[PDB]
Symmetry: none
Subunit: 138 residues, 2 copies
């Protein structure tokens, strides 16, 4: 059977945020939780963070390490078929003040062969202290 490949792309435009612990809560944000990105209009500034399980060698038989979460605009990424606000384990919905969550951006997702991940900045206040992320300069 050929595979059913339905996603237009699953690489987030942005670096992940990482939990600090194996049993960290889901991300919460001081402000909207939408990454800084001036390319979009206010109405279109909404999307979701999605959990990804991570593991390490050895030691072992692989061992778990803390989750990463990646941001996708609504209608893109692994949960592209969800409507904004639909409940799913591992999905946190975010929207800017002034967002119209029925709108759609044409921002799409990132081709990793052509683009490095973009830096995350949250000028309106980022995720809580259960999460960290590597510095990437502007």
């Amino acid at each position: 059977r050929p595979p059913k490949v339905g996603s237009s792309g699953n690489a987030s435009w942005f670096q992940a945020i990482k939990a600090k612990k194996l049993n960290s809560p889901q991300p919460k944000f001081e402000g909207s939780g939408v990454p800084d990105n001036e390319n979009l209009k206010t109405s279109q500034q909404h999307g979701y963070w999605r959990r990804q399980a991570r593991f390490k060698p050895g030691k072992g038989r692989r061992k778990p390490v803390p989750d990463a979460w990646y941001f996708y605009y609504t209608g893109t990424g692994p949960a592209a078929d969800l409507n904004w606000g639909d409940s799913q384990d591992g999905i946190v919905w975010v929207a800017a003040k002034g967002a119209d969550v029925k709108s759609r951006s044409n921002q799409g997702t990132r081709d990793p062969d052509k683009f490095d991940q973009y830096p995350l900045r949250f000028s309106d206040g980022g995720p809580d202290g259960n999460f960290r992320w590597d510095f990437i300069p502007l």
Copy 2:
């Protein structure tokens, strides 16, 4: 009329390759699943291996070294169909989604290239590390 056909013939992987960026890149590492998307399959079935292909090209003198290519096969299919998930073998890296049952033997088979094109890789749950790349294939 024709005799039986038991093997993976000269079928291919369902999916496009991942390619090393250098002649000395390490084998691919997968912090998340490393299993391509395929909505035919449930989470329990999402496991298999990446297998190295050596590559060479023509040019100055003749034989030129090209970076390694690695191709994905579901467990129980492909050149290493006889292995069980996790069996050591040089040029084989085992992958599985969180929640996979690496004994579930999927039903996707392999690709006859005269009938089906290579399918795009999409990695919901993580792909290979940054030593690897592949061209984007839309659709």
